[PDB]
Write a protein that binds this ligand. Structure first.
Ligand SMILES: NC(=O)C1=CN([C@@H]2O[C@H](COP(=O)(O)OP(=O)(O)OC[C@H]3O[C@@H](n4cnc5c(N)ncnc54)[C@H](OP(=O)(O)O)[C@@H]3O)[C@@H](O)[C@H]2O)C=CC1
Ligand SMILES: Nc1nc(N)c2nc(CN3c4ccccc4C=Cc4ccccc43)cnc2n1
Length: 203
């Protein structure tokens, strides 16, 4: 069971969504998201691919022109065996089942190898990922504007109460893990000030 990575864009009040949608239109954040979930270190095996895990509500909210996230192995978690109708859209009862589907489906008899696993969201899938003993990384984008949302991140990993578990890494570590250079400091895109951060937990 490889390490799990959580990627999220949230306000300072931990808000992450409004009405099954995003209360903001950031063009530079979305590019970060894609490169991060799509990047694979050269040294790893040649047929290495990434996986993005997502909840059901998060998958139905992505416009058909966008989903499924290309260049990545897509898995939808659902406590319901319903029709996904995909080009191979895997679905599992939980994080642990999803990981089991991957290892079984992708391995020796595969011409496709699993690289990094990303939990791309959904409040409910976040809490599950936060409770999992394998999550160890959190790629966070902080919107410095207390926008009005109605969906929030479960754990306040940036507050004091958790400061002994979650440690924010320097930007040099944030860039190396991503293999490329990324904007250091605030970024003001259309009256929004946000920045990238990477937090690591001890296992
Ligand atoms: N800003 C950001 O970074 C992100 C924001 N979002 C936002 O999140 C909101 C969607 O709401 P939310 O309901 O929280 O979305 P979720 O992605 O958490 O989806 C929840 C649904 O996913 C399945 N699911 C979730 N957790 C589990 C679990 N632990 N075990 C098994 N199955 C599970 C369910 O199946 P079932 O339906 O069958 O019960 C459940 O109804 C939207 O506003 C969306 O835009 C999403 C991703 C990123
Ligand atoms: N850093 C980071 N982390 C995330 N988890 C993340 N989630 C999203 C969510 N969004 C959604 C969500 C709800 C409604 C619309 C919509 C539109 C487009 C897309 C496209 C691809 C993936 C998500 C998504 C956006 N930006 C993110 N940034």
């Amino acid at each position: 069971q490889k390490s799990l990575t959580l990627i999220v864009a949230l306000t300072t009040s931990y808000g992450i969504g409004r009405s099954n949608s995003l209360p903001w239109k950031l063009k530079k954040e979305i590019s970060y998201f894609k490169r991060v979930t799509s990047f694979v270190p050269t040294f790893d095996s040649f047929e290495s691919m990434n996986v993005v895990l997502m909840g059901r509500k998060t998958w139905e909210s992505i416009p058909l022109q966008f989903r499924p996230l290309k260049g990545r192995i897509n898995v939808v978690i659902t406590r319901n065996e319903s029709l996904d109708l995909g080009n191979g859209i895997h679905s599992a009862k939980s994080l642990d089942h999803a990981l089991e589907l991957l290892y079984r489906t992708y391995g020796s008899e595969s011409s496709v190898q699993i690289n990094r696993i990303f939990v791309i969201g959904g409040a409910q899938l976040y809490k599950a990922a936060m409770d999992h003993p394998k999550l160890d990384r959190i790629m966070a984008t902080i919107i410095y504007k207390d926008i009005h949302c109605d969906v929030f991140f479960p754990l306040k990993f940036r507050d004091k109460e958790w400061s002994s578990v979650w440690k924010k890494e320097k930007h040099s570590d944030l860039e190396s893990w991503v293999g490329t250079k990324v904007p250091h400091g605030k970024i003001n895109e259309d009256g929004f000030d946000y920045e990238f951060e990477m937090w690591t937990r001890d296992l």
